[PDB]
């Protein structure tokens, strides 16, 4: 993995200019740090693919473009007149679902539409559970609903009973969806049982954003109380709680190396070593008198005047795509990526034939919609009843 370090006592890691690292880094990554400027349509939600291969931009007015960004390749660029809140890819670059004004639509590789969902009667946040082939939607109505996108079925019409769903986020390790409502409740859900599995109470007021670490072990949340919480998940214990950051945190995103990303409206602030369990690893803003027991943030970047509506890291590169009002920017964050991707599942050099074969392999090995569990290792177990020691018909 890449990294940086001060290697002095004067300069710091956070007051490092993107111009400076774009000068001191190689030409390929300095060329990959793209900055699209799109003005006439609205704020641009950003969704990369599961690998780093493509990019889906949505303007809130009308504008969705699925494009390769490494090579400049227009795949599907369409202005549909109604508003689009968010959108995502499905399993490849070949399909992408856009959450339009009310009806959620899904689209082919070249921009044709394929399904106007009669259900998902509105939508605000989509996600895709990739091993389960489940397109999950939540929004203004209190309905979290799951869609098996392979056979085109519905799976679960889960009633939230908590008003709208302010921010949802997928746990990438046990595939439970963490909704965060207006109550401060971050309730985490599975399509098998209607009652919400586990109702965390993270923040006060509405919860603005949730982001799950890729190891499934930490959950970072921001509320409109100007508060950010780090959560253990496997033990359900509030790790540490940054109170009173000087503006409401709009979005959080955690990279693939445990790297916290907080969007403070016009700011992007990145903390390294913020997902440990100590008291040192609480992310702060100042080393008070030069205190070596703080997390002064790893990097920071103040934008010009534009509200950043969503962060999102690039999977297998050291750069994060942040989406704001007047367009998209990639930010060189040198420790923000798995260098050693595993090419058996997802590959940033994948060609056409292995793309077809990898998707049909996942399509045969799609996990069923029932085994979404709070812990993934509870399938080869025995029942909690029908007691442990077996009896071989001698003492019954």
């Amino acid at each position: 993995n890449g990294y940086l370090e001060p290697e002095n006592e004067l300069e710091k890691t956070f007051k490092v200019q993107q111009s400076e690292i774009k000068s001191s880094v190689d030409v390929s990554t300095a060329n990959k740090a793209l900055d699209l400027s799109l003005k006439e349509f609205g704020p641009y939600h950003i969704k990369y693919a599961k690998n780093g291969t493509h990019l889906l931009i949505t303007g809130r007015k009308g504008h969705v473009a699925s494009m390769d960004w490494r090579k400049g390749q227009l795949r599907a660029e369409l202005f549909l007149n109604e508003t689009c809140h968010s959108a995502t890819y499905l399993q490849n670059e070949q399909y992408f679902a856009v959450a339009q004004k009310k009806y959620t639509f899904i689209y082919d590789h070249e921009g044709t539409e394929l399904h106007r969902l009669k259900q998902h009667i509105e939508a605000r946040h989509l996600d895709f559970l990739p091993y389960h082939y489940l397109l999950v939607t939540a929004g203004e109505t209190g309905w979290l609903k799951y869609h098996d996108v392979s056979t085109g079925q519905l799976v679960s019409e889960l009633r939230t009973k908590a008003g709208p769903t302010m921010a949802m986020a997928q746990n990438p390790w046990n595939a439970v969806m963490h909704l965060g409502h207006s109550n401060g409740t971050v309730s985490l859900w599975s399509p098998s049982m209607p009652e919400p599995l586990v109702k965390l109470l993270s923040a006060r007021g509405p919860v603005n954003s949730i982001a799950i670490d890729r190891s499934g072990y930490y959950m970072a949340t921001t509320g409109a109380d100007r508060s950010m919480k780090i959560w253990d998940i496997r033990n359900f214990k509030q790790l540490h709680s940054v109170e009173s950051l000087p503006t409401p945190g709009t979005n959080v995103s955690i990279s693939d190396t445990g790297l916290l990303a907080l969007s403070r409206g016009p700011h992007v602030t990145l903390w390294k070593d913020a997902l440990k369990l100590s008291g040192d690893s609480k992310p702060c803003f100042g080393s008070m008198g030069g205190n070596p027991h703080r997390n002064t943030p790893y990097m920071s970047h103040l934008f010009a005047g534009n509200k950043v509506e969503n962060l999102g890291f690039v999977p297998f590169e050291d750069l994060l795509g942040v989406g704001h009002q007047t367009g998209i920017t990639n930010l060189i964050v040198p420790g923000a990526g798995e260098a050693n991707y595993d090419a058996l599942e997802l590959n940033p050099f994948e060609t056409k034939k292995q793309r077809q074969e990898q998707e049909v392999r996942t399509l045969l090995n799609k996990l069923p919609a029932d085994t979404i569990t709070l812990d993934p290792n509870s399938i080869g177990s025995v029942d909690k009843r029908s007691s442990t020691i077996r009896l071989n018909a001698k003492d019954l």
Binding site: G2, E5, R214, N340, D342, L344, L367, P376
Partner: protein
């Protein structure tokens, strides 16, 4: 101040000539490969079918 990023370098991963096979570089991390039990359970279902 020392800065280095990934050096993907596009030569070890895509072959130089059009016949030899590319790498499948590979990380055996349980962090990478998420569902052990459900995935190989469904492979057992597919095998019995």
């Amino acid at each position: 101040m020392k800065i280095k990023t990934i050096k993907r370098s596009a030569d070890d991963y895509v072959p130089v000539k059009s016949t030899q096979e590319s790498q499948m570089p590979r990380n055996l991390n349980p962090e990478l490969h998420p569902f052990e039990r459900a995935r190989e359970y469904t492979k057992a279902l597919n095998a019995t079918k």
